[PDB]
Amino acid sequence: ESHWCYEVQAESSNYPCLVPVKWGGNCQKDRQSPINIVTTKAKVDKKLGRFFFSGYDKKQTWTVQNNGHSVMMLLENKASISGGGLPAPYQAKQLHLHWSDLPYKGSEHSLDGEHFAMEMHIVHEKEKGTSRNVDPEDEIAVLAFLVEAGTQVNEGFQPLVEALSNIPKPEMSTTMAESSLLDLLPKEEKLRHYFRYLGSLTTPTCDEKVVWTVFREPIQLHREQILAFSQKLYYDKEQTVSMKDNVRPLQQLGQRTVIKS
Ligand SMILES: Nc1nc(-c2ccc(Cl)c(S(N)(=O)=O)c2)cs1
Numbered sequence: 001e002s003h004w005c006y007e008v009q010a011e012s013s014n015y016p017c018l019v020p021v022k023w024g025g026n027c028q029k030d031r032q033s034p035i036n037i038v039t040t041k042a043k044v045d046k047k048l049g050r051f052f053f054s055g056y057d058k059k060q061t062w063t064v065q066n067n068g069h070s071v072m073m074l075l076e077n078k079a080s081i082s083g084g085g086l087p088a089p090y091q092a093k094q095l096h097l098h099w100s101d102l103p104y105k106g107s108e109h110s111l112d113g114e115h116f117a118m119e120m121h122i123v124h125e126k127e128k129g130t131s132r133n134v135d136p137e138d139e140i141a142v143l144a145f146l147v148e149a150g151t152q153v154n155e156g157f158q159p160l161v162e163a164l165s166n167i168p169k170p171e172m173s174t175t176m177a178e179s180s181l182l183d184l185l186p187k188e189e190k191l192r193h194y195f196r197y198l199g200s201l202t203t204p205t206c207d208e209k210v211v212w213t214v215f216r217e218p219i220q221l222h223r224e225q226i227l228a229f230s231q232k233l234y235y236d237k238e239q240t241v242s243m244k245d246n247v248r249p250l251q252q253l254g255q256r257t258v259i260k261s
């Protein structure tokens with residue numbers, strides 16, 4: 001009756017912990033995440049139009065913390081999304097990442113069997129209107145970006161990468177230098193192509209209430225920016241165990257299809 005952990009991080013920690021194949025909650029059901037996306041097998045759906053963004057361009061000073069599983073920035077409902085085939089507007093809650101130290105294994109989703117060096121999640125929750133009718137398959141909207149090593153610094157990512165130095169231990173926080181969500185995004189053309197499917201959170205309690213969006217095109221960071229995530233973060237307060245491979249094993253598609261824009 002304690003923490004959960006990632007496969008890698010079980011043989012290094014001192015509290016007892018549940019490994020992925022042993023996580024409880026809803027983790028062991030049938031509409032789980034992440035998956036492999038067979039790009040050819042996803043039928044084009046025309047209602048998957050462009051996403052619209054409010055608050056993404058606005059400069060801000062984000063609180064960012066090492067929660068012992070990832071590094072997370074708290075977005076406090078200060079940005080929002082519409083479009084992308086969604087039923088309603090969704091308020092931005094938090095953005096976090098998953099990574100490895102090897103280019104082929106840090107992503108949670110894969111595309112036609114390929115895994116990327118990291119994967120960025122921007123977690124939104126559906127807008128509470130002034131109505132509500134009496135297990136929502138789309139309570140949460142995750143925007144997901146695959147990251148690969150490019151040849152240049154992504155200057156957009158620099159206040160996040162620098163703030164890594166101030167939160168090495170679990171339960172530490174800090175404030176990033178001024179920046180926008182837009183700074184971390186790719187240009188809008190790179191945003192036109194993406195995959196969609198209904199799934200779960202990829203960490204316990206693995207609730208099956210996520211409408212997923214995975215953008216076909218990767219973001220690029222420099223190799224050394226990618227590397228700062230495993231070089232500066234730790235899974236442990238003592239700072240011996242480096243935070244990496246914070247990724248959930250793939251889950252089966254089952255009875256689901258994946259569509260695309
Ligand atoms: N404290 C922590 N929260 C999460 C979390 C929360 C909500 C979501 Cl939607 C996700 S994920 N990987 O499905 O996008 C992860 C991880 S660690």
Ligand SMILES: [Zn+2]
Nearest residue numbers: 096097121202
């Ligand atoms: Zn995630």
